[PDB]
Amino acid sequence: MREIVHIQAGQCGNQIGAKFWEVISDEHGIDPSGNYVGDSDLQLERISVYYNEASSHKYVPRAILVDLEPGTMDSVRSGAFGHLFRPDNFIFGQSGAGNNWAKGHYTEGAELVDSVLDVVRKECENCDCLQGFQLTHSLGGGTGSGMGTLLISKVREEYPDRIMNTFSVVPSPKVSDTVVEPYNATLSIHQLVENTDETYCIDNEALYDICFRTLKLATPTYGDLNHLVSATMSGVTTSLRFPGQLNADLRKLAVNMVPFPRLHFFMPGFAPLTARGSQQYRALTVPELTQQMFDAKNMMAACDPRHGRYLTVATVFRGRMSMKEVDEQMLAIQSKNSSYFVEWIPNNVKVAVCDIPPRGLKMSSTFIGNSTAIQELFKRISEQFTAMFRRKAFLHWYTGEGMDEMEFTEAESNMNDLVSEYQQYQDAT
Amino acid sequence: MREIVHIQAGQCGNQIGAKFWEVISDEHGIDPSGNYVGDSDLQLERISVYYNEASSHKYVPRAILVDLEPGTMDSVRSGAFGHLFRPDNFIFGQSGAGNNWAKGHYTEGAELVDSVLDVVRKECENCDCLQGFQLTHSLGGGTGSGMGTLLISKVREEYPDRIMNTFSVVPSPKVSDTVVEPYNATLSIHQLVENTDETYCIDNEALYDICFRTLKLATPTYGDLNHLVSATMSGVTTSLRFPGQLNADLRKLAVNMVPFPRLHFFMPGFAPLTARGSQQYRALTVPELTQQMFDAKNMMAACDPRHGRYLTVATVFRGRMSMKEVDEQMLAIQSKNSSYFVEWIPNNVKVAVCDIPPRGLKMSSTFIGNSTAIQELFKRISEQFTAMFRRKAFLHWYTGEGMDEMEFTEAESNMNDLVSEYQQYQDAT
Amino acid sequence: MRECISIHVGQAGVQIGNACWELYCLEHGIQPDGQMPHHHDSFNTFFSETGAGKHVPRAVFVDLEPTVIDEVRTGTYRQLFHPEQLITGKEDAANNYARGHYTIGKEIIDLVLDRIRKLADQCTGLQGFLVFHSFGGGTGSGFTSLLMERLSVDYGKKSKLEFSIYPAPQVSTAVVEPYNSILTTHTTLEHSDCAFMVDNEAIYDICRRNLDIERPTYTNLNRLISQIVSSITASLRFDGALNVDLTQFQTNLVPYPRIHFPLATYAPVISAEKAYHEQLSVAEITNACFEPANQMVKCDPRHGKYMACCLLYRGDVVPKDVNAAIATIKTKRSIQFVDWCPTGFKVGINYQPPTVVPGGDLAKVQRAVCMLSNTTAIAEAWARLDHKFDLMYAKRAFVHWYVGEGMEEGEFSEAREDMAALEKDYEEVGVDSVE
Amino acid sequence: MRECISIHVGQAGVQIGNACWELYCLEHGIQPDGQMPHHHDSFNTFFSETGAGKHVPRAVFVDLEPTVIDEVRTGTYRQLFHPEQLITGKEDAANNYARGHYTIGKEIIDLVLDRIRKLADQCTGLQGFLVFHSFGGGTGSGFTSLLMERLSVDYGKKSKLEFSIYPAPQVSTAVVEPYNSILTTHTTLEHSDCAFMVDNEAIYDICRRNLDIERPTYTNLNRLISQIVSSITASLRFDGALNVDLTQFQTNLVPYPRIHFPLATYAPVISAEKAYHEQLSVAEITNACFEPANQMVKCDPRHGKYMACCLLYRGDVVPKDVNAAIATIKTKRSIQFVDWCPTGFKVGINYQPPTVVPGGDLAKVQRAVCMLSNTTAIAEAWARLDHKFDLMYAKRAFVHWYVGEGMEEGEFSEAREDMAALEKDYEEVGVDSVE
Numbered sequence A, B: 001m002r003e004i005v006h007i008q009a010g011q012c013g014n015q016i017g018a019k020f021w022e023v024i025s026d027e028h029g030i031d032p033s034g035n036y037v038g039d040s041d042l043q044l045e046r047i048s049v050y051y052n053e054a055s056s057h058k059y060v061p062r063a064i065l066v067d068l069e070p071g072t073m074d075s076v077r078s079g080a081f082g083h084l085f086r087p088d089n090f091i092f093g094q095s096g097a098g099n100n101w102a103k104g105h106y107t108e109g110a111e112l113v114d115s116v117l118d119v120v121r122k123e124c125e126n127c128d129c130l131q132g133f134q135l136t137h138s139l140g141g142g143t144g145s146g147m148g149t150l151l152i153s154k155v156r157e158e159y160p161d162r163i164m165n166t167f168s169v170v171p172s173p174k175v176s177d178t179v180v181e182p183y184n185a186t187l188s189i190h191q192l193v194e195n196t197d198e199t200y201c202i203d204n205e206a207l208y209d210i211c212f213r214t215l216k217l218a219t220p221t222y223g224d225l226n227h228l229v230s231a232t233m234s235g236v237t238t239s240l241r242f243p244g245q246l247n248a249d250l251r252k253l254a255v256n257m258v259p260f261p262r263l264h265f266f267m268p269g270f271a272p273l274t275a276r277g278s279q280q281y282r283a284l285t286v287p288e289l290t291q292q293m294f295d296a297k298n299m300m301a302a303c304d305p306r307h308g309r310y311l312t313v314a315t316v317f318r319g320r321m322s323m324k325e326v327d328e329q330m331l332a333i334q335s336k337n338s339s340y341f342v343e344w345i346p347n348n349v350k351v352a353v354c355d356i357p358p359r360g361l362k363m364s365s366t367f368i369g370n371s372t373a374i375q376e377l378f379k380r381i382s383e384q385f386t387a388m389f390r391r392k393a394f395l396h397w398y399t400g401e402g403m404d405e406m407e408f409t410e411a412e413s414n415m416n417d418l419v420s421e422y423q424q425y426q427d428a429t
Numbered sequence C, D: 001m002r003e004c005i006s007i008h009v010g011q012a013g014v015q016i017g018n019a020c021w022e023l024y025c026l027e028h029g030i031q032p033d034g035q036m037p038h039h040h041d042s043f044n045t046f047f048s049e050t051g052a053g054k055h056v057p058r059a060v061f062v063d064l065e066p067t068v069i070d071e072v073r074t075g076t077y078r079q080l081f082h083p084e085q086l087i088t089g090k091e092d093a094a095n096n097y098a099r100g101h102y103t104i105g106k107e108i109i110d111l112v113l114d115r116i117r118k119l120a121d122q123c124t125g126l127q128g129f130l131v132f133h134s135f136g137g138g139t140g141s142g143f144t145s146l147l148m149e150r151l152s153v154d155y156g157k158k159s160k161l162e163f164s165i166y167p168a169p170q171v172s173t174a175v176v177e178p179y180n181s182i183l184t185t186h187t188t189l190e191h192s193d194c195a196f197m198v199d200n201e202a203i204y205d206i207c208r209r210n211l212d213i214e215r216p217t218y219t220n221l222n223r224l225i226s227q228i229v230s231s232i233t234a235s236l237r238f239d240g241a242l243n244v245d246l247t248q249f250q251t252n253l254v255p256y257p258r259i260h261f262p263l264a265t266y267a268p269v270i271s272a273e274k275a276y277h278e279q280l281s282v283a284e285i286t287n288a289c290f291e292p293a294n295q296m297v298k299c300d301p302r303h304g305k306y307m308a309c310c311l312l313y314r315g316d317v318v319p320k321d322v323n324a325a326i327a328t329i330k331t332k333r334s335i336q337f338v339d340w341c342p343t344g345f346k347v348g349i350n351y352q353p354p355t356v357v358p359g360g361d362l363a364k365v366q367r368a369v370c371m372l373s374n375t376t377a378i379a380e381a382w383a384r385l386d387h388k389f390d391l392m393y394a395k396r397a398f399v400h401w402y403v404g405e406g407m408e409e410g411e412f413s414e415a416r417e418d419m420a421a422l423e424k425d426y427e428e429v430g431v432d433s434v435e
């Protein structure tokens, strides 16, 4: 009931998804072979939302892993946790997009999308009652950004009356992984703003600091970095996967959070984050949980909220608490930190409570804040994209595979408009 | 309830505190591992004042140990009694202040003062009522005096309606540990007399003499020296940690003993002080205890009271007695020694009685006297500072890191004013 | 699954290729005879599988003078290469580009093309061409221009990377080097996606100073250049935490159609005795590789400004300190990038530590870095070569050899004006401009 | 953590450093090869850890003549030092200050700076530099003043201590010592935070009389001076009941920017057989080190007045009898202090007893004291040296070697008036002033 479709694009999506389906398997008591070995029947109460029933009590995920370059798939197939996926879903192309938008939207986008859309339709018809779509990708790569935009569009005419959540890894200010980031990002964001519902922007170096500073890890690899982002992603969904005292669903989050069609870029955060050695000297209690969430340091996006104002805020608890303690503390937060909240939405705190605590923790929480601190992220990206484009650098290889200058002019004009409306509403009276 | 924050600055504060939390742990029946192993229930009646309740009945002290160099924390962290502090509290820098005021208040202190201040605000949010701050530092070092004053000015801004006590270690008149003492001390006092409520001045040679003749020890190391100052420091606080016939607390002492805003420099003292061998030839009873404290020999500050007059006096008894025997002796002390008391404060004796004896003792006492004889101590220090400053010796390395000539002129101009009023009130009619 | 073919031209290409296929075979755990004693595909991209256990490379060795190929035929690697692939002529171009491109070079180009077409149709996922050729040589320069024209005509749009050998400023071996280089650059300027340069003495300075060898025969020089080539391809051959494809190199390094002349660098290059007294940390090999003295082209980067860089870490590498290392490099004073490129770094990470060739001068290392810098310090080298060519041609020296072998002086004029356009574009792009 | 790098200059520095770095591995339990059979860091301040168990010192050996370094390379401590660190020239300065500062010294100073900058960036918490240079030599004096100029600009404000070797009054191995010493002191006066002076003849009296040794070779002299250096930095490497730092020494002993010339002193210095007949109490080693005959510079403290002192105990030392001992020392009429310094003592205590090298002349002691007196008695020594320089320069003797090597006669006037200013300033603040 209320089934969810999970789509993966680019190298990041497959690596994040590899850690994702690891978390879900432990949550639902699923052996790597694919057979139920747990005890509680509560996990079976709603198992069809993600997994799928099969013969001999086998379970297969509703995931569609697809990427142009094959190199990622041999890793997921040959590696562990590859005995439970559906071999038909393992879609791959022939050559990677090469960090090019054009090769991800016109050249190799044509033949690959037709194949992947077929598996979506078959998966949708198998579904009993569709709830929405989940897409995990990156805005810096070529295949994940370029094709993911194409897939988001092709899905959109097919299911107009549906919602989707895109958990994108937005590029960093400090360190840039690839040289031509702004060309892929600016083009991708223009299309997403047109035809998407909500978007959870996530940074890398911000999660780098969190792992090194708070968890005190000397060598934070991609294994640990992707592990933390999976827990936030599992926390967002678990409201409808598991019963709770004040339940919420993907539809509830979308409407509570998005006041306007063009302002749907969120910023997540998770708590508690404690080291292995320092967990014994801290009291696991709601006061410190909410305090840990509401500081700039424990935030998974590299934008300090102090330069902006929280437009709307969510908080999806887990474990067992009191609504009194939960909402008494939201009062203490609101009264003390009132200078940082937008004046013209009152009571802008949405709270939901579950009952199943996360593994190895008495209780935890997930904070999703639609803030005005993203305006500094888009301003910087637009600045980087502007200077590079005026001198017409790297342009010969987007023009040489389908596009021309009119796409670049209109994408820049739209992005300037969006940051204009974003600021003009923050400074409204 | 009525919690207090304990701050340690410099090497002395860390060394005093390392053995201070030794005596506090025995009083509350705390194993070195951090778990309660005591018997009497009265210990847990007020345990939150110093320790913090945590998961699985573990207790974590409310301490903030900070030094500009890592040479001090290596001992406490690696050594015993280091598995119960919270590692977040173990704040340290990279290079010591180097016995310089500038390198601890202007240049190097500012970098680390933001980290400790943020811990202070985070320190006892769980803590529900602040009673005050307890600071242990030195007036001769660089980090103990330099940034310790920096913390006092900054902390006072955030908690103005609160009282704090600094248990400083005032310099010596016979042997000086560091060559540039008067420059470091005088610059500190000009800032201390403005942002503190009361200061406990303690010497070292006076502690040496007491441990030599009275305790019969020929080679007292720093371990046997700091044990004497811990008991006095624990005696002042234990009024609000344990029940008593006539209770007192930190706020109570400040009212009785600060007649004027600038005259808040006290002189402690402890009794009984008897050797282990010669403990069988004395009868433990109130008669000798009151006589023991009021002689010049058993005084922890090297200033002979006979050259001055007591203004106000404490006697924070412990153990169990009858207040009649207490006031029968305070009457005998007053009548026989009436020449050593100021005329314009009648009945200037404050007495409080507790109900829990110190460890291995039937009864004990703590004497705190806001005597006038301190005026001879500041007279000597201002004499040494004057001789060094006209020659401008050692000064080319104070202006080179932030200061100038005008600052030194005002610090001495204010200090001679303080010794003027400290004596003008003694001779006032 | 994704296939790239390698063409080796001239004595330089064959000798380098012998050292290159020395290390690819070692990297994949293949014995010299084709048998065998992460691992299982990988080898499918280079070593085509025969029905038996024998693997044969996708290499096309072509030369006009047969003595060098007769060496590789009779060498230790006799059973590896396909006997049809080794194509030999009868006499070389004798450092005459006119001979090697017009008169004699045209009589064997049909045979090499047929072997290329047969090999390409054998594979299913053809990606691009790897060309190993020199610049001074008559056959190396003469044949490569013919092959680029022929290959580009057959295959429309594919990646075409070349690993050239840039002529030196004071080290010289030919007397017609300015003539061969200028002619080669002009004709292949439009048909090369990305061409790497290497200077012979720059490795000699590196081998003498960094590794401290006083007998650096061409074997030791070939071993160092071979190491750069493999780790560039190693992303295609091996999985990694951040995979980079041949197009990704080509897309991330070429900002303009004409400015496609980067240079290579490798690190760490340290000896066996100094291995014990070093810690081989990620933060320092990033610093060591970027150090101007470690560049493998005889040009100081301090004289110019970087335009784009690409790093490739392999082995036990964490992306965090790699992230940290580039942060300090960017904020460092000596490094200066160009204004229109606020971001100028591409990072690729692989899980396979580099292997060591037995008997090699280098020592075993668990981390390796390869740096591809597209900069402006190369522009000073082009001007110097242009000066040498202009000095010699000023009085029509050696032109009688070239003119008689099917050329005209008009062609020399067009190549001269071509290099002026390239140099003027290179400086005007590197120099800042208002608005 | 806390880092300081050591520069060894000239034959004196390399010979002293061979004995000095011999002691540190003894203190930290490091075998000569690198392996091992209070202890956990500690060695991170001097021994930079390689990934393996091997420790390599943070030392830079620089010299112009390869005779002495080759002994270090071939010595028993062959595997410890980093082979790149041992920097050699080709010929020495030959007791010529001009050669080692202008002509030949300048051509190698860039190489040593490269190893300094590389080593400093490797460490994290660098504090300052320890320089082991003499005064009479060419490379030990001429080249080290160049290093001060090079090091100071790169690192603006850091501690800089030079453990000099003061030329002796009557003992003189060289003939141009007054010309060398005056020139190097003038240029290094404004770039040295704290310079320690040692006289070679002064130790000889100490070794003959106190230690009862009749064959005091340079290896026996160097063992005794190594103990002074070790205990100065004994506070950084070990915990203590009262710790001192590189800065704590540097601000407690320099009342004026020019007057920063203290002198060392060690105690106890007694033989093996004489150990039994001495009880070795704290109250007397404080008295022993204050005796005029145990000073390490041939200047009687009675002729002058102490300005500041600094004691450093280590071992089974309790602070109660320490400050008691100084109390009796202060009231003694033989030791006199300056009026404007009512307090002139600094103490530092450690829990690590000094160790003894095997085969050494000194016996095992559970306590040790190092006294670093900044006194006016050294002003008589500057006057004596200035007298010799003024005597020979009057008729311009030996000048032709210096003038023809890149100097001028006018430059000698500046160095002469510079010592004129210092000699009176030392006395004028040492003597009382009106009002």
Ligand SMILES: Nc1nc2c(ncn2[C@@H]2O[C@H](COP(=O)(O)OP(=O)(O)OP(=O)(O)O)[C@@H](O)[C@H]2O)c(=O)[nH]1
Pocket: A009, A010, A011, A012, A013, A015, A016, A067, A068, A069, A096, A097, A098, A099, A100, A138, A140, A141, A142, A143, A144, A145, A169, A177, A178, A204, A222, A225, A226, C241, C242, C243, C244, C248
């Ligand atoms: N959080 C996270 N991000 C990653 C990880 N690996 C790569 N990324 C990000 O993803 C981007 C890579 O772009 P991709 O879309 O994956 O490109 P690709 O899959 O190699 O294929 P092409 O787009 O053709 O190059 C980089 O900019 C990284 O910032 C990962 O393991 N975890």
Ligand SMILES: Nc1nc2c(ncn2[C@@H]2O[C@H](COP(=O)(O)OP(=O)(O)OP(=O)(O)O)[C@@H](O)[C@H]2O)c(=O)[nH]1
Pocket: B009, B010, B011, B012, B015, B016, B067, B096, B097, B098, B099, B100, B138, B139, B140, B141, B142, B143, B144, B145, B169, B177, B178, B204, B222, B225, B226, D241, D242, D243, D248
């Ligand atoms: N009572 C007592 N006093 C001590 C002890 N250790 C040091 N002191 C005093 O502390 C002073 C030393 O200055 P500190 O404040 O410790 O200086 P620091 O912490 O080392 O930091 P810097 O000033 O930068 O060197 C001396 O004057 C001693 O009188 C101790 O163990 N017990």
Ligand SMILES: Nc1nc2c(ncn2[C@@H]2O[C@H](COP(=O)(O)OP(=O)(O)OP(=O)(O)O)[C@@H](O)[C@H]2O)c(=O)[nH]1
Pocket: C010, C011, C012, C015, C016, C065, C092, C093, C094, C095, C096, C134, C135, C136, C137, C138, C139, C140, C141, C165, C173, C174, C200, C218, C221, C222
């Ligand atoms: N790095 C490297 N360069 C080489 C090696 N052998 C030759 N060269 C270069 O190749 C140049 C000689 O031209 P080649 O391309 O070898 O000419 P060829 O192969 O003999 O055939 P012809 O051009 O007809 O003479 C010289 O300038 C060298 O710089 C080698 O083993 N290693």
Ligand SMILES: Nc1nc2c(ncn2[C@@H]2O[C@H](COP(=O)(O)OP(=O)(O)OP(=O)(O)O)[C@@H](O)[C@H]2O)c(=O)[nH]1
Pocket: D009, D010, D011, D012, D015, D016, D092, D093, D094, D095, D096, D134, D135, D136, D137, D138, D139, D140, D141, D165, D173, D174, D200, D218, D221, D222
């Ligand atoms: N204490 C001590 N002093 C030494 C030793 N060896 C040389 N000296 C001193 O060094 C002085 C000689 O000048 P050096 O500094 O050694 O000159 P150098 O290092 O040989 O360099 P050049 O001047 O160029 O020859 C003599 O006056 C000695 O006092 C030694 O082993 N121990």
Ligand SMILES: [Mg+2]
Pocket: A010, A011, A067, A069, A096, A097, A143, C243
């Ligand atoms: Mg990819």
Ligand SMILES: [Mg+2]
Pocket: B010, B011, B069, B096, B097, B098, B141, B143
């Ligand atoms: Mg200190």
Ligand SMILES: [Mg+2]
Pocket: C010, C011, C065, C092, C139
């Ligand atoms: Mg040839």
Ligand SMILES: [Mg+2]
Pocket: D010, D011, D065, D092, D093, D094, D137, D138, D139
């Ligand atoms: Mg010499």
